[PDB]
C-alpha cells in the first residue's frame, strides 16, 4: 500500500511544551509523510482524513476561568497562506474554587483538500495541563483517502 | 481499476435537518456509489469500512436531560427492514443555572461491514435541531470498498 | 473480493458486567485470517493497519467519589509478550431522583503491527457498559 499515512504522539521528554514524535511503540510516518517544525508535511495532492485528541488534567480549580484550546492548521506553501482547519475551546472549571483532580479532553476531527508540501500543525494554549500519566492519550494524525 | 467510494457532506441551508450532499466540494461519489432518497446506496456486493461524524450545538445547560444520538443504520434489498450497524448516545449537560454557556459536541461513528448489492445506508440524528458546521467540528457520511 | 485482513467485533449482550467480544454474529465479522483468542484480535501479517473501537458507558445518577471512565486499545509484542497501549482515553461523567447519564468512547489510528501480535479493547468500569441495542460498542481492524 501507497496510501500517505502518518500517526504521531507528545513526546514525553519535552515536557511543558507539545512537541509530536513518532516514538518507537505506537507511533509512525509512511508513505512520504514527513515530521519538521513540529508539523506534517503532506507528500502529494487529495483529501486527507486529519484526527486528534488532547487531554488535560489538573488538582482544583484555581482563580478565574481557566480557558483551554486545541487547534489544527494548515500552511500552504504557495504564498505561505495559513488557514484554521479545526478549534474548539472548553472552560474546566465552574465555582469550585475551595480540593478534587479535573479532567478535559478535546478531540478534533475531519476531512481535507490537501496540496504537495502543505504543514499541518496541532498546538495548544495550556501545556502546564497536558496530562502525559499514560502512553497514548494525546496523539495527531493523517490518512489519505 | 478503481473500487466504488464516496464522501458526502450536510446541507448548511437546510434548517433544522440532516440533509446529505455529492454535488459539493469536497464531496465524492463514484464508481457505482449512489446518493438517493437521502441514502447512499451499494453498488456491489462486499467490504467496506462505512464512517460518519455529526457536531452539536446548544445555547446553554437547562436541564441535565438533554440527550443525543447518532445512528447509521443498514436497510437490506431482501428482508427490506431497518437494523442498526453504529449508534452513540451522549449527555452533553452537568447541572449550570447565573449564566449559560453554548456547548459543542463532535459524534464520530465508523466500521467494517460486509454488504450486499442495492442495500442502503442511513446516517440520522435525534436532535437535528442541535445540529451545527463549526471548527469543532464536520458533518459527512461516506462509505469505502476494500 | 478483498483479500485484505479484516476484523469487527461486537460486545456480547449476555455477559453481565463482562466486556466479552463476539464475531461473525449479526454484522460482526473475522476475515482473511483474523483470528479471536482469549478476548483479544491475532493480528495474520505484517503491515500497516486502520484500528478503531466505541465503548458507550451508561449510569443512573452520581454516586460517591469521583467516577473516571477509561477505554484503552493494547498492543501484545509476539517474541516478548510485552503490553504496550496504543491508545486511551480518560472521562469523567459526574460533576456533583434517578437521572441517567450516557459516556460515549470511540478511539482510532494507524499502526504498523508484525504477525502474531494480539490486540485487546478494555475498560476500567464494566458495571457501566451499555450493550442494551445494537451497534453501541464494537473493536475492529483493517489493513492497508
Ligand atoms: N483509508 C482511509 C481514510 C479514512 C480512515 C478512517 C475513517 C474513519 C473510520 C472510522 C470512523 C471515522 C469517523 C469519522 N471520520 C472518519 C472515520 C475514514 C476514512
Ligand atoms: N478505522 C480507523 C482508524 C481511525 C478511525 C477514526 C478516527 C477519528 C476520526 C475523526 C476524529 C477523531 C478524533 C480523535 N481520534 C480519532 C478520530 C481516526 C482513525
Do not use: M
Amino acid at each position: 500500500s501507497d496510501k500517505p499515512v502518518a500517526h504521531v504522539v507528545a513526546n514525553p521528554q519535552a515536557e511543558g511544551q507539545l512537541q509530536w514524535l513518532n516514538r518507537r511503540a505506537n507511533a509512525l510516518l509512511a508513505n512520504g509523510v514527513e515530521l519538521r517544525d513540529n508539523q506534517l508535511v503532506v507528500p502529494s495532492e487529495g483529501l486527507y482524513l486529519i484526527y486528534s485528541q488532547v487531554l488535560f488534567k489538573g488538582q482544583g480549580c484555581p482563580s478565574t476561568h481557566v480557558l483551554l484550546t486545541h487547534t489544527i492548521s494548515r500552511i500552504a506553501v504557495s504564498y505561505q497562506t495559513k488557514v484554521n482547519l479545526l478549534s474548539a475551546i472548553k472552560s474546566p472549571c465552574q465555582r469550585e474554587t475551595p480540593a478534587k483532580p479535573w479532567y478535559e479532553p478535546i478531540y478534533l476531527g475531519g476531512v481535507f483538500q490537501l496540496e504537495k508540501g502543505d504543514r499541518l500543525s496541532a498546538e495548544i494554549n495550556r501545556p502546564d495541563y497536558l496530562d502525559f500519566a499514560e502512553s497514548g492519550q494525546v496523539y495527531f494524525g493523517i490518512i489519505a483517502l
